């Protein structure tokens, strides 16, 4: 039976995860093993740099966090979450953490370099994706959330800026800064305005259903070319999110609108992904009837496009950023807070 095969897959994946979750890797490289090349992108907490490993010549993407800034911004526990989770997961659509380490000043997470750029860039440039193309990407996120949620993990920052396109045209999810292992509910106000579920905005307890809401926002944005709730300032976005009103482009199919209303339910107890049948309400929806879930997992479906590749170390699929010096103090900062990193 197909359903038993999925249960067995997830049970073994949890056994594998828990071993790494309980005994995390630590201190697996050092800064002078790498030459720093160029900044690939930024987030609210730090930057990610293209680096080259001196001995092998391999390129990687290195996230750098300033320990004192993390402390000042009250992100200590979130940063410990990020690294502990990312070193423990293993999934086709999650970026691989290759090394991690810290020094007197900074924390470092060295990932596989995903060269095709952010989905964001491609989506803005082309305007919108066709429904088949949006469906190809969406299916990868559905499987990824099935995996993460089965491990008690909530992701909490889905958006095109965090979905990188690999050389086969498939997604790699990056930025686990808000990911958290939780059984039952949590309360932190975090995420990106356009993607926040109503229960986050309204300061309610919330659960994995916020990721399913965010999937609704993502699919809408991919297929429309703009988000379902947009404005010039966050507060106006929040008013629209909580209203229960959503409007769809005239070109959206019947099945797409039906799926989206089910994911964009303002009452989390009525939201797809959070009903008795869980993820299967999504996987069995008419909009996904042509999706071969195992073929997607195995990366056997033809991709909408292959990013352009001009040799190793090429960053032409990414914007340019102002560069700043990575300084390392002679004195250790915030040692006790980051002991476990």
């Amino acid at each position: 039976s197909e359903q038993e095969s999925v249960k067995e897959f997830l049970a073994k994946a949890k056994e594998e995860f828990l071993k790494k979750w309980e005994s995390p890797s630590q201190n697996t490289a050092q800064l002078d093993h790498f030459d720093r090349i160029k900044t690939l992108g930024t987030g609210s907490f730090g930057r990610v740099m293209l680096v080259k490993h001196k001995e092998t010549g391999n390129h990687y993407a290195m996230k750098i966090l300033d320990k004192q800034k993390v402390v000042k911004l009250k992100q200590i526990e979130h940063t410990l979450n990020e690294k502990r989770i990312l070193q423990a997961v293993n999934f086709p659509f999650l970026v691989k953490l290759e090394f991690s380490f810290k020094d007197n000043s900074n924390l470092y997470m060295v990932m596989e370099y995903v060269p095709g750029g952010e989905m964001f860039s491609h989506l803005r440039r082309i305007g919108r994706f066709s429904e088949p193309h949006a469906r190809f990407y969406a299916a990868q996120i559905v499987l990824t959330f099935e995996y993460l949620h089965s491990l008690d993990l909530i992701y909490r920052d889905l958006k095109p800026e965090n979905l990188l396109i690999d050389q086969q045209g498939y997604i790699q999810v990056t930025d686990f800064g808000f990911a958290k292992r939780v059984k039952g509910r949590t309360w932190t106000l975090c995420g990106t305005p356009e993607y926040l579920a109503p229960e986050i905005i309204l300061s309610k307890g919330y659960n994995k259903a916020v990721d399913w809401w965010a999937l609704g926002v993502l699919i809408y944005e991919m297929a429309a070319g703009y988000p379902p709730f947009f404005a010039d300032q966050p507060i106006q976005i929040y008013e629209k999110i909580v209203s229960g009103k959503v409007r769809f482009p005239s070109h959206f199919s019947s099945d797409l609108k039906d799926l989206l209303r089910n994911l964009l339910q303002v009452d989390l107890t009525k939201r797809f992904g959070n009903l008795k049948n869980g993820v299967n309400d999504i996987k069995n929806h008419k909009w996904f009837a042509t999706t071969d879930w195992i073929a997607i997992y195995q990366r056997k479906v033809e991709a909408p496009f292959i990013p352009k590749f001009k040799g190793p170390g090429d960053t032409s699929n990414f914007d340019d950023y102002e560069e700043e010096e990575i300084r390392v103090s002679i004195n250790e900062k915030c040692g006790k807070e980051f002991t476990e990193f």
């Binding site: 987030g43 907490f45 803005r124 703009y226 988000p227 947009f230 010039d232 482009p249």
Partner: peptide
């Protein structure tokens, strides 16, 4: 059009977390 209203808005670039 809704598209034109989005393209003229202030939130068409990369969006940061709150």
């Amino acid at each position: 059009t809704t598209y034109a209203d989005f393209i003229a808005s202030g939130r068409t670039g990369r969006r940061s977390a709150i």
